[PDB]
């Protein structure tokens, strides 16, 4: 049963404080240095802190000062406590098992939690504006639509093309982050003999904001 | 604080070849104890990232034989001896020997297939969207290989980048291609004050860029 389970992520501002917990089960808990160690939206991978089995704490110098690490060998959970969060400390937070006790000649991270995302941003909850994107019609054998969903927050939104019974020809793109508010869009391609004749509708959820819009694409000249 | 880079930074494969990654330290790994920390581990996508090697070559518990590590003092490189589908995700060195413990960029291993030219597509600004006053014109750039390609807009013959918005799809577990999607936004006031719109792409495919240009008055 050796298992991380990280909670307490969320949406906080910058300034702000939250705390985040990991439980562990599986092992004696006790008898493992564990660490924290946080993934940025591009990717990067950033070691925030390590406890010894014996107590020894070591912290990453930026956060030396904001952050507390702590644990509870009772319960099998470790800690960490965030205050004056900057927009930098927005990432996925892992707890990771080090093999490692105090004097011990070994140690690597060889259990991992599944992680909780923590975003600082001073920005709020905004529904999308979703835009149909269809071809000049004044303008082949397959044609490209499109939906343009703009200016949400937070992540995510969800997008499906005819409720789902469209799922091949389909790219969906990545969130971008553009002056606090996120911008995405989807495209979907059909046989030049399907469209217009057969109606096609993209559907965005934000959940959110409980938003759920169906818009249908149809031909226009621009 | 120890910098470790990892080369290449994208690393495409066909399953079945032989791989090798290189980190590099900044400063030497060793630590005052006399042994090596560095370990490596493999992400996929949506998971947790996962030990491979650690202490330069000492497999974790379940990791196939295919993974080797070596490698002395601040050169080391993971090999696969022969690459399977679930091998593909990010690679990532790590050091352990210095506080504070860094993690090296990540090496991307991908599916190599042929090189395939993007579709491209431009989408004039929806009347609704015009109706709140903004302008955005979209062009979606698919299914094209390798990922480096370059997008520029351009306004009437001049280049504009102030208002772009680039986003990536990973690789295609279909086709192995990629796809790009670019948003040029202005205010309703400055797009019709233009008449011609340009997403040009340059991309190892063709010689000259594929433009892709919709003109107001031809609308
Ligand atoms: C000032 C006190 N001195 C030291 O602290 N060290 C000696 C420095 C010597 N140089 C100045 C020349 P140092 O090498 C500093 C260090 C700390 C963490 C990590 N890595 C990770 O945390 C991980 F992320 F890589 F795992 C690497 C190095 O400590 C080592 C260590 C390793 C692992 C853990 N852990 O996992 O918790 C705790 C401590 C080890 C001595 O070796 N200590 C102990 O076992 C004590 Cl008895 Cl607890």
């Known amino acids: 049963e050796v298992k991380l389970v990280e909670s307490g992520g969320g949406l906080v501002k910058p300034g702000g404080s939250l705390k985040l917990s990991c439980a562990a089960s599986?092992?004696?808990?006790?008898?493992?240095?564990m660490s924290w160690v946080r993934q940025t939206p591009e990717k990067r991978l950033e070691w925030v802190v390590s406890?010894?089995?014996?107590?020894?704490?070591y912290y990453l110098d930026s956060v030396k000062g904001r952050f507390t690490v702590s644990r509870d060998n009772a319960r099998n959970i470790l800690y960490l406590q965030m205050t004056s969060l900057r927009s930098e400390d927005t990432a996925m937070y892992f707890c990771?098992?080090?093999?490692?006790?105090?004097?011990?000649?070994?140690?690597?991270?060889?259990?991992w939690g599944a992680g909780t995302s923590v975003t600082v941003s001073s920005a709020k909850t905004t529904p999308p504006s979703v835009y149909p994107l269809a071809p000049g019609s004044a303008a082949n054998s397959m044609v490209t639509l499109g939906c343009l969903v703009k200016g949400y927050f937070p992540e995510p939104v969800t997008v499906t093309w005819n409720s789902g019974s469209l799922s091949s020809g389909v790219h969906t793109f990545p969130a971008v982050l553009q002056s606090d508010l996120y911008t995405l869009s989807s495209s979907v391609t059909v046989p030049s003999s399907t469209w217009p004749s057969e109606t096609v509708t993209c559907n965005v959820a934000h959940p959110a904001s409980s938003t759920k819009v169906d818009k249908k694409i149809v031909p226009r000249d621009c | 604080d120890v910098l470790m880079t990892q080369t290449p930074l994208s690393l495409p494969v066909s399953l079945g070849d032989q791989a090798s990654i290189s980190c590099r330290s900044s400063?030497?790994?060793?630590?005052?104890?006399?042994?090596?920390?560095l370990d490596w581990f493999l992400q996929k996508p949506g998971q947790s990232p996962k030990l491979l090697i650690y202490?330069?070559?000492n497999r974790f518990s379940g990791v196939p034989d295919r993974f080797s590590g070596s490698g002395s003092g601040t050169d080391f490189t993971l090999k696969i001896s022969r690459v399977e589908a679930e091998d593909l995700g990010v690679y990532y060195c790590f050091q352990g020997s210095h506080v504070p413990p860094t993690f090296g960029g990540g090496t991307k291993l991908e599916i190599k297939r042929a090189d395939a030219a993007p579709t491209v597509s431009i989408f004039p600004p929806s009347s609704e969207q015009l109706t709140s006053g903004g302008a955005s014109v979209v062009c979606f750039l698919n299914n094209f290989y390798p990922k480096d390609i370059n997008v520029k807009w351009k306004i009437d013959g001049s280049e504009r980048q102030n208002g772009v918005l680039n986003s990536w799809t990973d690789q295609d577990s279909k086709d192995s291609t990629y796809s790009m999607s670019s948003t040029l936004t202005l205010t309703k006031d400055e797009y019709e004050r233009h008449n011609s719109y340009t997403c040009e792409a340059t991309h190892k495919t063709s010689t000259s860029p594929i433009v892709k240009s919709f003109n107001r008055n031809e609308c």
């Open positions: 406890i010894s089995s014996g107590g020894s704490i």
């Open positions: 400063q030497t790994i060793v630590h005052s104890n006399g042994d090596t920390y």
């Open positions: 599986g092992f004696t808990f006790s008898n493992y240095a």
């Open positions: 990771a098992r080090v093999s490692h006790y105090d004097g011990s000649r070994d140690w690597y991270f060889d259990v």
């Open positions: 202490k330069v070559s």
